Amino acid sequence: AEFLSLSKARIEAYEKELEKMKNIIPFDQMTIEDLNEVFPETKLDKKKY
Amino acid sequence: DTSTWFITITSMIMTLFILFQLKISNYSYPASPESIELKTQKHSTPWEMKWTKIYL
Amino acid sequence: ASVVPLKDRRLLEVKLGELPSWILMRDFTPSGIAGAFQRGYYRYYNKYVNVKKGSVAGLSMVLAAYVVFNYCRSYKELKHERLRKYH
Amino acid sequence: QFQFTGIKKYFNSYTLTGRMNCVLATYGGIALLVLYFKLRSK
């Protein structure tokens, strides 16, 4: 029952992730930082191409 | 014309390369957007592997 | 006087080219989607009609301002005028 | 002042070789000398 114990919170955290994923897309012309959660940014000299 | 004496413009050119490194530094690359979709796929697949190991 | 000249360009940008996005400006962004290019249009005759998404009247006013601003410095040198007027 | 920390990570990267305007300053400052000298001898 450890799968029924541990992955139950992993189900609801994935279920809550589907709630915030609806929030981010918003308007077409929405934001330059709210779109900076899914698509990534990094430190200096990461993107080679 | 053949102008002279040069104490002018060249000190007013390097102030300009504080401007152009300010504007062009805030640009966006289309390619970086295709990279963030890759790491989201492998993370939940390993999380499902963490759930498969939670089964096995 | 710095907040005076800075509020000149931010008025001559967001009206006649091109009023950007970043919500808190989202409906302000579509305010440029209709554009004030219909307001900017009537000066030439009609002909620069292509201003819809490559906006001529947004840009061609600054470059028309930078010409007549540089006509003033050249005026002292190329005098040429008689004791009369031209044709 | 914020025309610095936007590009301050860039500066000490490449100004180690890029900020050698002293050779431009020496080739400029010597170029000052011959033109004041020719107008001195007219």
Side-chain angles (χ1 to χ4, degrees), chain A residues 1 9 13 26 40, chain B residues 1-28 30-31 33 46, chain C residues 1 5 17 20 30 32 34-36 40 54-84 87, chain D residues 2-7 10-26 28-35 37-39 41:
Chain B
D1 195 73
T2 80
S3 58
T4 45
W5 150 91
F6 295 172
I7 310 195
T8 171
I9 329 164
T10 79
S11 172
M12 288 74 83
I13 211 174
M14 203 57 209
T15 172
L16 202 72
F17 286 7
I18 313 153
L19 299 195
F20 271 95
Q21 292 165 72
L22 268 169
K23 308 194 151 199
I24 212 161
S25 45
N26 274 352
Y27 265 50
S28 65
Chain C
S55 292
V56 163
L59 188 79
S60 179
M61 272 165 185
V62 164
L63 258 69
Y66 176 72
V67 165
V68 77
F69 163 63
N70 284 327
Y71 177 60
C72 308
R73 328 269 70 80
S74 158
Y75 167 64
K76 175 180 171 314
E77 278 85 332
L78 40 75
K79 38 186 102 68
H80 192 273
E81 40 192 357
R82 291 177 296 273
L83 67 164
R84 243 163 50 200
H87 285 217
Chain D
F2 274 82
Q3 291 175 7
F4 175 77
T5 176
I7 54 184
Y10 273 52
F11 277 8
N12 41 13
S13 153
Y14 68 78
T15 50
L16 312 174
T17 82
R19 214 47 62 94
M20 286 296 115
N21 311 348
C22 166
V23 181
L24 162 70
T26 298
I30 295 170
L32 302 179
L33 298 197
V34 70
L35 271 192
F37 279 13
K38 248 177 205 168
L39 299 200
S41 278

